[PDB]
Design a protein around this ligand. Structure first.
Ligand SMILES: [Zn+2]
Length: 7
């Protein structure tokens, strides 16, 4: 699946 990191 797809991954997003929003710091
Ligand atoms: Zn994946």
């Amino acid at each position: 699946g797809s991954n997003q990191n929003n710091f």
